[PDB]
Amino acid sequence: LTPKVQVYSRFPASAGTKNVLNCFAAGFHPPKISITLMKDGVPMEGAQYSDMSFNDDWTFQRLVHADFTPSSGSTYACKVEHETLKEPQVYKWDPEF
């Protein structure tokens, strides 16, 4: 079952203001998965991986989150690899500022 992925910040974002970038993958099976937060095509440092869980329907989910300060000049994304995907899938964060 393919992962369904959302990318969002803890707080509504503003340039130069400290925040947390989240990538949430859900609805997937098998549980093995690679989720990587990225800035300008480079992995973000300091990423933390919440305990893996699963929902009432047995499908697996994982949150990854990293402290960051969003910059206007940069693009942020989540790269996901899973057996159901022939190639890695990149999900872009919308800064909304």
Binding site: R10, D51, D94
Partner: protein, 273 residues
């Protein structure tokens, strides 16, 4: 009416991935993660400040013993099930979910369920004191467990032990579980291909339930409106977003409404320039 829930889940995996534990085991009170065990650490650790503060070493050691016991049995179960399905290698998982719900302090639900490779396998039916076989391969498990008379002990756990502990946990974490955190909401718009997509995003709310609706002409508009559902932040709070597609130039006709326990009246938000 005061509702509370205690839920334990566990997973045993043949293929967790490089560096990762094959067995993971977590508990939830009112949907909030409070304990974690895995096969590498070989102990339970707290995941809320209230359980860390209020549980003593005997509690941790006692839970750790149960985790280690369950790890061992689920390792065995993975092997048993692979043989029953005539399977070697590949990716397989065993999952369990069980617990109890209380309403005004009294039990209203107790469940104990297993899945193999993501599909229902067996469940306890506490009312008939039997086990259900969801698939043909579960019929030998039903037989074994019914013949072994385990239903009495499981019923006692679900109606007594689980309930007594859930009452204790809700006391330990009463202030945290009952708190309210207000969402910070932002409306944002993007036009592409002749369509103005408006977004209403609610950041950082607790508790989890929320309603976020797009209005036009005073009326809730589910047509062309799409919710991402409710997703977690790192910190015990939640996030949601809802979009709606509009005609360019129609942005000021739409308003997002947010209904949440933290908000005595619904929040109303519009798209700024």
């Amino acid at each position: 009416m005061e509702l509370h829930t205690l839920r334990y889940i566990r997973t045993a995996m043949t293929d967790p991935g490089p560096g990762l534990p094959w067995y993971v085991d977590v508990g939830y009170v009112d949907g909030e993660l409070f304990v974690h065990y895995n096969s590498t650490a070989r102990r339970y650790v707290p995941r809320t400040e209230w359980i860390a503060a209020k549980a003593d070493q005997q509690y941790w050691d006692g839970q750790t013993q149960i985790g280690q016991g369950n790890e061992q049995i689920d390792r065995e179960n993975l092997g048993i099930l692979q043989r029953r399905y005539n399977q070697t290698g590949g990716s397989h998982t065993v999952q369990w979910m069980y617990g109890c719900d209380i309403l005004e302090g009294g039990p209203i639900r107790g469940y104990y369920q297993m899945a193999y490779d993501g599909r229902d396998f067996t469940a306890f039916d506490k009312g008939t004191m039997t086990f259900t076989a969801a698939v043909p391969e579960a019929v030998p498990t039903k037989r074994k467990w019914e013949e072994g008379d385990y239903a009495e002990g499981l019923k006692q756990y679900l109606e007594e032990t689980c309930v007594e502990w859930l009452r204790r946990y809700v006391e330990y974490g009463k202030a945290e579980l009952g708190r309210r955190e207000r969402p910070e909401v932002r409306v944002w718009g993007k036009e592409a291909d002749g369509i103005l997509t408006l977004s209403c995003r609610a950041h950082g709310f607790y508790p989890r339930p929320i309603v976020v609706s797009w209005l036009k002409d005073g009326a809730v508009r589910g047509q062309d409106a799409h919710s991402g559902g409710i997703v977690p932040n790192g910190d015990g709070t939640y996030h949601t977003w809802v979009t709606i597609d509009a005609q360019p130039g129609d942005g000021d006709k739409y308003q997002c409404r947010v209904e949440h326990a933290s908000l005595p009246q619904p929040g109303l938000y519009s798209w700024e320039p």
